Structures are given as C-alpha cells and as structure tokens.
C-alpha cells in the first residue's frame, strides 16, 4: 500500500509539478471586489494571491468560494438591493470576514516534497496551494488536487503498479456515504449557495422527482452569472442557470461500486472532473466520492 506511493511523493518535489509556461494573476487589497470578479472570467483564471501594498506580504487567496460567500451573505432582494456590494472592497471584506476566525495565508517552497504539499492540502482543507520560492519571493504556480492525481495515474506503469488494484470501490469504504446533500432541479441557486457556505461541499448533483442525477451544479459554474450579467437575479432555478450549455455537455460522468479503482481513476483523469457520482441500476445516489478523499487514501 504505502510502500510505493509515499516513497514516490517524498522523493519528488513540487518544482517538477509546475507546468512549463503558465499565466497567473495577483490582486491588490485596495481593489474592489466586483472589478476583480468581472476580470476573473475575462482572464480565464479563478484564483489569485492577494497582495497588500502596505504589509509587503501575501495576505491571502481569492477563489470562487469568496465570491459565493459574499453573494450569499449580502443578498436581500433580486432587483433593487444590489447597490451595496458593488462598492465593496477586498480589504474591507477581508477585515469583516476575519471577525469570526483568523486564518492566515499558507505557502510551501517548490523545493519541498510533494508529500508536504498534499499534507498541507488535507490538513488545512484548501484546494489552492501556492508555491513561493524563498529566495525570489515570487508566486510561481497554484497547486491543485486535479494536477497531482493526473500526475499520479499517468506516471504509474504496470511493473510498479501496486497489488491494491484488485479491491473494489464498495468494499474499501472511501467517500461520504451517509449524508448526501442534494437539491431539486426546480430549486433556486440561493439554497444551493446556502448549502455550499454552511457545509464543506464542493458541488451538488441535482436530482429529479425520482432521484436520478440529470446534471450537476458546481462552485465553478457560478461565474457564468458574473460573465453574462445574470448575478442580479438569484430567484431563478438551477435549470435556468445551466440552460446555457444544454446544447454542449455530453452527459453525466458516473461510475459504479463493482468497477475497479483503476478504471475509475482513468475515467476521472480522462473526463478531468472533480468527482464521479456512484449510482445503481435504479440510478439512486448512494454516495459521493471526491478527489481529496482519493489523495488522502493515496498518502496513507
């Protein structure tokens, strides 16, 4: 089990993980929110390290979870209240947001091992882990779960493949199987956002009257509101919001409990998604797996 994976993640450093040429942005704390948000769709990136001009350090990170938080927390009506949050600032939301708890910015040197990176990932429950060189002080890349799992599966070869392939997904008991948070396809976005902010969930697979997953509602999908200027109205359902790509998506990416973990991770790196909803012949949703759970299993 841990004979080959832990060794492979301790011997290789984070430097090799970084791609050759990439585009990265950073934000200032004096900037306003809505500006940076409208910018995040035009630039194609969803995350940015915050830089405060006065403190001369990296104060934090800006992801789409912050977008979701500010949208849910400050929302009264759907057409005449939207004034207040337009003029809001990044450092002002930073100051009011850390009234409840003080969570600083975490970073890892790219010379350190991959094991320490995925250790920071799990132990702080953060998907976006910057790498900052100690000498130059520059923020090279933002490490992600998806990259590390694609690099684990693609690199491995049949002669170093473990003996752990034989066990099936069911019997191994990996994932959250008890409390599956769901929403209906006629429920608005607002409640899904509530469920996002209150729980630790990364997406919701929407269900019909029977309980068959026809689509999914991701925390990344919400930026299309800020792209098509439809963030004003949150009363509409998630079917109205996902209608934009109804001509484009192929289908629901899903696996079973009787398949092998090999084929599951290969269809996961081949579809490049965050999860595979496990269903049955009925298509009722028993449990949801995550990338983070797979990484946690791999490290130990």
């Amino acid at each position: 089990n841990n004979s080959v994976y832990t060794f492979f993640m301790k011997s290789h450093r984070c430097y090799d993980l970084i791609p050759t040429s990439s585009k990265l942005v950073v934000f200032d704390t004096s900037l306003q929110v809505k500006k940076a948000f409208f910018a995040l769709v035009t630039n194609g990136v969803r995350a940015a390290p915050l830089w405060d001009s006065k403190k001369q350090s990296f104060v934090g990170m800006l992801t789409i979870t912050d977008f979701i938080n500010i949208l849910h927390r400050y929302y009264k009506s759907a057409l005449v209240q939207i004034y207040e949050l337009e003029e809001h600032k990044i450092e002002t939301w930073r100051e009011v947001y850390l009234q409840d708890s003080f969570k600083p910015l975490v970073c890892i040197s790219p010379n350190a091992s991959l094991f320490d990176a995925v250790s920071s990932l799990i132990r702080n429950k953060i998907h976006r882990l910057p790498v900052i060189d100690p000498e130059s002080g520059n923020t090279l890349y933002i490490l992600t779960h998806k990259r590390i799992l694609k690099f684990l599966k693609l690199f491995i070869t049949e002669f170093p493949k473990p003996e752990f392939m034989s066990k099936s997904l069911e019997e191994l008991q990996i994932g959250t199987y008890a409390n599956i948070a769901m929403v209906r396809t006629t429920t608005p976005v607002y409640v899904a956002l509530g469920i996002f902010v209150q729980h630790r969930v990364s997406a919701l697979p929407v269900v019909d009257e029977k309980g068959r997953v026809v689509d999914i509602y991701s925390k990344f999908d919400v930026i299309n509101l800020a792209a098509e200027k439809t963030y004003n109205n949150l009363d509409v359902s998630v079917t109205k919001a996902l209608q934009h790509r109804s001509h484009y998506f192929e289908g629901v990416l899903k696996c079973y409990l009787h398949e092998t973990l090999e084929t599951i991770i290969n269809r996961l790196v081949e579809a490049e998604v965050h999860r595979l909803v496990v269903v049955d012949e009925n298509d009722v949703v028993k449990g949801i797996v995550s990338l983070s759970d797979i990484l946690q299993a791999l490290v130990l």
Binding site: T20, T42, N224, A227, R245
Partner: protein, 407 residues
C-alpha cells in the same frame, strides 16, 4: 611557441585577431590547430573582455560537429588556444573545387550545421559571422564550425547593438544599425549558406556596396529549376526579410525536405514532462475534416458566452522633453538614478520595511516618426535569499512612476 609537446607546422591563415598554425606532437604526431592571439595587438584595442567572453564559453562546449576548445594557455608573449585540427580544410574550397552539390550532400551538411548552431543557441551564445570560409571539413567530410572570434554571449532580456560580419552574409536588419536577436541572423546566414550549397553562387551579390544593401533588403532572389519546390518554399520562408515571418529552428525541424534521410544522432524529468504532463500547435488538416472537439472543463462557459495588451507607455513629444519630464518625476518621487546613455537609466529604490534594495532599467524606444515607447525592464539579484517579491516590488516601482507620469 611550444608549451607541452607540440612543434608548430605550416601557417593556416591570418585569422581575425592573430594567425593560426598547426601543432605536431613530438612523439605520436597528433595534429592540433593552435590559435595565436598576439598579446600586444589585443591589448592595443579594448577587446580584452570580448576575448574573455569567448574563453569562458568555449571551456564548456562539447559537440561532435563543433570545434572543441581543449585548453587556453596564457603567457606574456601571446595567448594560445588549442583545438582539434581537421584535414579537409574550409568549406569554400570544396564549394569551389566541387562546384554545385547534389541534394544528399548539401542536405547532410546543412543538417550537421543547423544542429551545431542549435546546440550553440541553446547554451546562450550566438556567433555572428557565418560563411563557408569559417567552417571546416574533416577526413570524413562532415561539417565542422571553426571560427568563434566574432561570437558573443546571450544575456536575459538583452538585445545586440554590434553588427559585423561579411557584407554579403549580414542580415537585412543589422546593416541598417537596428537592434536584433541572435537566432534569426544566424538562421538567415544559414539559409544563404544552404543556398550556396545548392546553386554554387551567392544569392545577394554585387560589387557596388550601396546596391548590395538594397538587394539584400529586397526579398527577391533567383529560383532555378535545379531543385524541388519544397526547398524553394523553405528558403523563401527562411530568408524572409521580415524577422517576424522568419522561421525558427523548430519551423525548420518539422519541414518536409529536412526530415528526409536524417540520422537522429544530431538532435538529442524533462522527457517525463514532455510526454504525459503536456497533454494534460494547431493542426490545419485536422480542423478542416473535424467538427468535434473536447473542450477543457475550465473553459466551457467562455466559448458559449462568446483586450489588447499594449507594449508600454506612449507619449508623442520631443525625446529630450519626455526624458526630462521623466527625470523630473523620478526625482519628485525622491528616488535616485544613474545614466549610462542619455536615453538609458539604471534606477533603484530601497525597501521601506526591510533594508534590501530593488533595481530596474529604463530604455526609451521609437515606434515610428510620430510616436515613441518607454520600456520597463526588470533585473536579477545575484546572491541573498530575500524575504520579498522581486516581481511585485518591480511592478510597484513602475506603478508609482506611471501614476506621476500620467497624472
């Protein structure tokens, strides 16, 4: 002369700086080529660093088609560089002696050469002067590149001002005193060499020197029926007068003619990244016959729901006027400068929170007769691991400038 075991033979040539001779080992009879740089003659000129930036470089280089510097021995009489000596002599005497060459030979040689000059480009050196008289041949009649006197060192984000070399083989851009990058002038001298290796005659030839520059700056050249159109294409695209439309080592690599009959011992964690990580150039043929594509999941709302990056600051005014305005505003900002050239500055600030210092360079350009451009270039820090961001301190210095310069 003799240093260790070599008795000099016959004088080969006059060389760039000093003459070159042939050593001969006293017991086995090995033949080396010894470059004699006369001490007096190079100390007269200021070139004493230009030789250094050759000596530094040629100590590292090892390539089977590049002439390998063995050792450099310095003594108050003169400087000695020992290199491998080949029997076949210079290329222009085989061009002369054999006239025009067929495709198999010219091809093979051009591949060996191009592979050399790639190997050089990658290690951040560019040798300006390319001509058959600077490149030799061995007993196996391969391609050897000898003369490296007129070379230079490639620095990060630094163009080249010095234009030298043969009058026929000098690039169209360098003859008009223009700043230029190292790879394309080499590629263009490669392409005129390749032309010479096929027809026998120079592509741009004339006795009158001003007419020659005009003929170089013009893109027209003779295209015989001696060879297939693939090479004609490859030359037209390789010898383009526009450096933006001039091919690169890649662009030549994936060309049809070039691939044919190519032994692979020319081009050599890096390879793991190359294969699997990169998959994670647009093909023209695939686009025409395929209407189905698989978009990355991060992009999929953008091409369903569907920005011009300027070079820098442009203000149309007098050069001295704008530079005086800039030197007044950088002083108003209480920072400090030095000037090397009247249009060049090296400026630095001190960190307010730490005791460290950050630097950068300013060079004013001209986009055209009506408008100028003011460029902003960053630098490196040699030694200390500083707990601060170079890139951000640079951007903030540039911002604090541009704010006072606009408003």
């Amino acid at each position: 002369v003799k240093i260790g075991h070599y008795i000099l033979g016959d004088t080969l040539g006059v060389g760039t700086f000093g003459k070159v001779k042939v050593g001969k080992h006293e017991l086995t009879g090995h033949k080396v080529a010894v470059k004699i740089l006369n001490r007096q003659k190079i100390r007269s000129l200021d070139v004493v660093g230009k030789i250094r930036r050759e000596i530094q470089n040629l100590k590292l280089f090892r390539h089977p088609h590049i002439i390998k510097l063995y050792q450099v021995i310095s003594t108050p009489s003169d400087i000695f560089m020992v290199m491998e000596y080949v029997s076949g002599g210079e290329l222009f005497d085989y061009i002369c002696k054999n006239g025009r060459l067929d495709e198999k030979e010219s091809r093979r040689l051009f591949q060996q050469i191009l592979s050399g000059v790639d190997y050089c480009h990658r290690h951040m050196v560019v040798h300006r002067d390319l001509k058959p008289e600077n490149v030799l041949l061995d007993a196996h009649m391969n391609a050897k590149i000898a003369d490296f006197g007129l070379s230079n060192m490639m620095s990060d984000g630094e163009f080249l001002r010095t234009s030298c070399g043969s009058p026929n083989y000098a690039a169209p851009e360098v003859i008009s005193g223009r700043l230029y990058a190292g790879p394309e002038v080499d590629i263009w001298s490669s392409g005129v060499i390749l032309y010479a290796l096929l027809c026998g005659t120079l592509p741009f030839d004339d006795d009158h020197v001003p007419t020659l520059f005009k003929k170089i700056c013009d893109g027209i050249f003779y295209t015989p029926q001696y060879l297939n159109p693939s090479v004609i294409s490859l030359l037209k695209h390789m010898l383009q007068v526009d450096p933006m439309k001039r091919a690169t080592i890649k662009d030549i690599r994936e060309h049809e003619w070039f691939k044919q009959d190519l032994p692979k011992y020319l081009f050599p964690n890096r390879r793991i990244m190359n294969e699997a990580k990169d998959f994670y150039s647009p093909p023209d043929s695939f686009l025409d016959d395929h209407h189905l594509t698989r978009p990355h999941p991060e992009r999929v709302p953008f091409l369903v729901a569907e920005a011009k990056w300027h070079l820098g600051i442009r203000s149309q005014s007098r050069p001295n006027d704008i530079m005086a305005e800039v030197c007044r505003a950088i002083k108003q900002l209480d920072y400090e400068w030095k000037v090397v050239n009247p249009y060049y500055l090296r400026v630095r600030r001190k960190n307010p929170v730490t005791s460290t210092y950050s630097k950068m360079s300013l060079q004013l350009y001209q986009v055209d007769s009506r408008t100028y451009l003011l460029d902003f270039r960053s630098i490196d820090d040699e030694l200390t691991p500083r707990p601060g961001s170079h890139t951000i301190e640079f951007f903030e210095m540039c911002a604090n400038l541009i704010k006072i310069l606009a408003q």
